[PDB]
Amino acid sequence: QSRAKASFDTRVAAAELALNRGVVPSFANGEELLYRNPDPDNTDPSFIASFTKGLPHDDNGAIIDPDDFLAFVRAINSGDEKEIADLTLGPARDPETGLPIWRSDLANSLELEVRGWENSSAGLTFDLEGPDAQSIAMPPAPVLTSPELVAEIAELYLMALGREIEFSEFDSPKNAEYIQFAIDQLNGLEWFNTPAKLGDPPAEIRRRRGEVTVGNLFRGILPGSEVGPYLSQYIIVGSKQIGSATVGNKTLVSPNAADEFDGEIAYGSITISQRVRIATPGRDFMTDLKVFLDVQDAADFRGFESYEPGARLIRTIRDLATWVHFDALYEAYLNACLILLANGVPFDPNLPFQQEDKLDNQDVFVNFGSAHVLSLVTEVATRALKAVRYQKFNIHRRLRPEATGGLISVNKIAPQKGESIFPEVDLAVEELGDILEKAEISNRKQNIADGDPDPDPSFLLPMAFAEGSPFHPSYGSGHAVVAGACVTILKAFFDSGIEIDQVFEVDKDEDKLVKSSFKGTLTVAGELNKLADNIAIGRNMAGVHYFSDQFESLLLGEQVAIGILEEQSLTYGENFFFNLPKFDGTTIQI
Amino acid sequence: QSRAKASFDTRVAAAELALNRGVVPSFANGEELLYRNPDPDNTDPSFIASFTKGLPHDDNGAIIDPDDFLAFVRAINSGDEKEIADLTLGPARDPETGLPIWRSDLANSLELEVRGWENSSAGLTFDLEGPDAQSIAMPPAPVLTSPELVAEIAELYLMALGREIEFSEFDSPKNAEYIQFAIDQLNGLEWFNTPAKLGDPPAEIRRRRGEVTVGNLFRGILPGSEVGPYLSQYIIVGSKQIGSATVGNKTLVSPNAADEFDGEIAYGSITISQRVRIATPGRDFMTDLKVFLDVQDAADFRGFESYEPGARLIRTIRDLATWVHFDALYEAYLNACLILLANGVPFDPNLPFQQEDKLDNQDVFVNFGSAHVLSLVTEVATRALKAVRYQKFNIHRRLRPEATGGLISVNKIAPQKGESIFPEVDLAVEELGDILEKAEISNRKQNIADGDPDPDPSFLLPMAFAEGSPFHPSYGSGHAVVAGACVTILKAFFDSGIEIDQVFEVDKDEDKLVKSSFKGTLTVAGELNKLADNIAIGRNMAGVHYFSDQFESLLLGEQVAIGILEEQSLTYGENFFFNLPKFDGTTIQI
Ligand SMILES: [Br-]
Ligand SMILES: [Br-]
Ligand SMILES: [Ca+2]
Ligand SMILES: [Ca+2]
Numbered sequence A, B: 001q002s003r004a005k006a007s008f009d010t011r012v013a014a015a016e017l018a019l020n021r022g023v024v025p026s027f028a029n030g031e032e033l034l035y036r037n038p039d040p041d042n043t044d045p046s047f048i049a050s051f052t053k054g055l056p057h058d059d060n061g062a063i064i065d066p067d068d069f070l071a072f073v074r075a076i077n078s079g080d081e082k083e084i085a086d087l088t089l090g091p092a093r094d095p096e097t098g099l100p101i102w103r104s105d106l107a108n109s110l111e112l113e114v115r116g117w118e119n120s121s122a123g124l125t126f127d128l129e130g131p132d133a134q135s136i137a138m139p140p141a142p143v144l145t146s147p148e149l150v151a152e153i154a155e156l157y158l159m160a161l162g163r164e165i166e167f168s169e170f171d172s173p174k175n176a177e178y179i180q181f182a183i184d185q186l187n188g189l190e191w192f193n194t195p196a197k198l199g200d201p202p203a204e205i206r207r208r209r210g211e212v213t214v215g216n217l218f219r220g221i222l223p224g225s226e227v228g229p230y231l232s233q234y235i236i237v238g239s240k241q242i243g244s245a246t247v248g249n250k251t252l253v254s255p256n257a258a259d260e261f262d263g264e265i266a267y268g269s270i271t272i273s274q275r276v277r278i279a280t281p282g283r284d285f286m287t288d289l290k291v292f293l294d295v296q297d298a299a300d301f302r303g304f305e306s307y308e309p310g311a312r313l314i315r316t317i318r319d320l321a322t323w324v325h326f327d328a329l330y331e332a333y334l335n336a337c338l339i340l341l342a343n344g345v346p347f348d349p350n351l352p353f354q355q356e357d358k359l360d361n362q363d364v365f366v367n368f369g370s371a372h373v374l375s376l377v378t379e380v381a382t383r384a385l386k387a388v389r390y391q392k393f394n395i396h397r398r399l400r401p402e403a404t405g406g407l408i409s410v411n412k413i414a415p416q417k418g419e420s421i422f423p424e425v426d427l428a429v430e431e432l433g434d435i436l437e438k439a440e441i442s443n444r445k446q447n448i449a450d451g452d453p454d455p456d457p458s459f460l461l462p463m464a465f466a467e468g469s470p471f472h473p474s475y476g477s478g479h480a481v482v483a484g485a486c487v488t489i490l491k492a493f494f495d496s497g498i499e500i501d502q503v504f505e506v507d508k509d510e511d512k513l514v515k516s517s518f519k520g521t522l523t524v525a526g527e528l529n530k531l532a533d534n535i536a537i538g539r540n541m542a543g544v545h546y547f548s549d550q551f552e553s554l555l556l557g558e559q560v561a562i563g564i565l566e567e568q569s570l571t572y573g574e575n576f577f578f579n580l581p582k583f584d585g586t587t588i589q590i
Helices: A003-020 A066-078 A081-085 A105-110 A120-124 A147-161 A173-187 A202-207 A258-262 A289-296 A317-325 A331-342 A370-396 A401-417 A426-431 A433-450 A478-493 A524-541 A547-569 B003-020 B067-078 B081-085 B105-109 B147-161 B176-188 B202-207 B289-296 B317-323 B331-343 B370-396 B401-417 B423-431 B433-449 B478-493 B524-541 B547-571
Strands: A264-267 A270-273 A276-279 A307-312 A504-506 A513-515 A579-581 A587-589 B264-267 B270-279 B307-312 B504-506 B513-515 B579-581 B587-589
Touching (some): A003 A547, A003 B003, A066 A081, A066 A370, A105 A289, A120 A370, A147 A173, A147 A433, A147 A524, A147 A547, A173 A433, A202 A547, A258 A264, A264 A331, A276 A317, A276 B270, A289 A401, A317 A524, A331 A370, A331 A478, A331 A524, A370 A547, A370 B370, A401 A426, A426 A433, A478 A524, A478 A579, A524 A547, B003 B547, B067 B081, B067 B370, B105 B289, B147 B176, B147 B401, B147 B423, B147 B433, B147 B547, B202 B547, B264 B331, B270 B317, B270 B331, B317 B524, B331 B370, B370 B478, B370 B547, B401 B423, B423 B433, B478 B524, B478 B547, B478 B579, B524 B547
Antiparallel strands (some): A264 A270, A270 B270, A276 A307, A579 A587, B270 B307, B504 B513, B579 B587
């Protein structure tokens, strides 16, 4: 048939193949209508566990008008420009000047404006490749009264108080006290010590973590994430620089070969510096109740973080939070791809024309080569982000971890004033005694540094971002969804089973890379899974996503990338398939 | 209807839109069968002006067996891995070791292996987005006998002699001698001084260049590319760094804000260094006829280039040729996207939710925001590359500038031994008198520095690449096609009319950025088109593509990106359109 007709038939076949996977029914966990207003005469939902950021709140963190949130859900579902623009985002505005009235003196002094929701209607957007944004489902979110939410909040609080601790010094005497405290606190939760029971949802069993030790503290449960050093190589180490290529029998050593171990990627002919901007040690954000409520009222605190001069490799937990703050959602994975290409890590052996050119008489650049893997790893980003935008806005609308920190703060502060509100995070407040008193001390220090001479006790979750979380629900996680998608693309493309010869870890005292104490071996698949875990959990260290958000988002992104590869494989007429190890350990040939 | 069916219908509608565009019939120019063998008793085509790189050659630059090039063409048109694998790529091998027998002592001492064609079957590969690789056309390439090819090869030779010439010092007295020589030589060619006549094909009329001056020497004919400094800001300058964002009424200055004028992009939390690996100055490659024949015989000289320690901003023509060597084909364009995002340059005003979040109540990240353009400007790259592969392999198969230099050199050396071969490049040889004399001087210097004590006269085109051009025909150009596509995406996304306040240029005698003598105003569209011009003419400065290659490839990439944007706009249900200023002045709304 005609080439135009053949291409049209190929696109139609890809669309039909996307259809054949079907729409997995995505179920919310019901926190939207389960929690009602505590007022005896008001039966309207409190929407405390829903993503009520941007809508006006009272002094306690819930929305003053529930109909504000139903309008938000209607705008999400319809996606109309005017309907979204008609929402009551932000607090009451000053009639004379139009500036919204902020609770905190900081936001009022800054004369902050409101910030809108980040692409509420992106879930409704269709995709020309991969599964539709609504064609793939994520499991019901953890409930506020469930022990899983308690464990997630414990883990995030323990990252917040340990944002100044270094990844290389997790098992170090100086950080031993805090690391053991965090391990004991996590192992004291029903989620970690008690194993999954028969009859629980399969995703809940799959995403349930076991006993927390030093070797898996603040780590994901992806295969290869819990082995070797904490930081993935493709997040710290550079790459084989320009000029370090073997031509014929001889191999030239680039004069800039030291940049490979310095943490400098060979971004083609230029260099990507793996060193991250140094956010100020110990400066957490949204530790004040008024500032937290202003941020929940859509305070545009974006860019308010203070940074130290220069840049350094990821060493502290706050450094990883900064790394994932303005991450491009494929910056980490494009960096991994560039490292793999520069390092000479060959693609999947099942890809065509991967042999030495004496045999196949063909070099792979546009297809099954550098350009193809780069383009696929950065194009899996948009479809995955649309899928996670659907899972965030149109189904789950989970409250952000800063919102669950605010609920816990008001719950633990209410007895001090003789009140009692949010009997939903009561289990969390009871279970997080030591964690929440450490958090109270940390937030008192942070508020004293902020300018409050004697701040009231605040058990709010310390957060590395001035603006708090991005302005979309916590479940699922956009960076973890694109993590799963891009890392799955890279594992399908590159020979993911290849062991890494040089395992590098950041120095205890210096800003440079040294050989890790890990005497074992790490695969390329292991490194990419560790990088996906790193980028996902760096959001937890920012306090912007829970762990279950990260894991289920990684699985959803894995589905996104699998669908894209299945649809893309129809385009290439070569006999080939992607030997892709999934996040569950099984390998799917695409 | 159902959401799965709605998504299927949207994808089928994008496919139908690509189909209704219709296949534009892409005509070759006839070089394949027009030039016969000079042997009186052999009527087989010589294929001197077709892409015969890889196939065995004799001591003159043609293929010894033309029936080996028709096998290559059949492998191109079919696509089968097995058919490609049986081609006779490389020269006759050695029966005991297997390693091919080379002509040059360099390639034999290196013990090189053959290198394969870079995705010769990628043209047949379909896509799930944009125009098919065969649904759009490029005009026939200029013939060897044409005055255009004379101009392109003369300009590439002049670029090769002036690879040590600095962009900032084009209008400086230190290079004014060679610069004026180049201007006078280009103005002497019939292509430049004589204007396009009525009847001439519209594409050649459009791509014809006028009088060459300092301000347009070695520049493209894209809008805004000719005006301002040579280098585009989005190839030299960095971007507003992390921490420089303004919050409310208070603007923050980053502690490392001096990196935006240093040449250090804000790759989110990390930094992309705009500095480029310093290639060894003066050292050109493929200046010896034996080494050039070995490269034509598929000598894997990849990575053989020598580099100086450290890195510097693009300051010499060789530095731009090196910048585009390992370019990811969206490296420059991803850099431009990151610069534009970090600098705060607004997106297209016609995109939705682009207002201050107190009006639209929505922030754009996934769609019409950072992630959308960030991923489109790269996802366009592989579709553009498939289209240009088609154009390279299945239709045009234009010989590389190194191949045209080899023909010119053999033709000009034939009278020295009394022979007379390649009447086709006779006009190019006779017009290029002073240019080829300077080329002979430079090639003699390079061959003396390469080991030969008394090199034979060589008029070969000196090239900054040890492996020479990649293994695909020069027409069209992969990086120029992706330049057109990515710059078109960037202009359709960002507000291309935005005037750039700070226009910078590399210091004349230092590796740092200073303000430029350009007193006019430059736009985001101007610098994006200038960046596409920079990448394309940097491929030319490498001696791997002629100018018509770059310009028609840029037009093809513009076509690719318009098609991709048209099919994408169907997905987004928001009311919006891209205000895209095409490369021909006119603005298309998508
Ligand atoms: Br997101
Ligand atoms: Br290409
Ligand atoms: Ca190969
Ligand atoms: Ca907006």
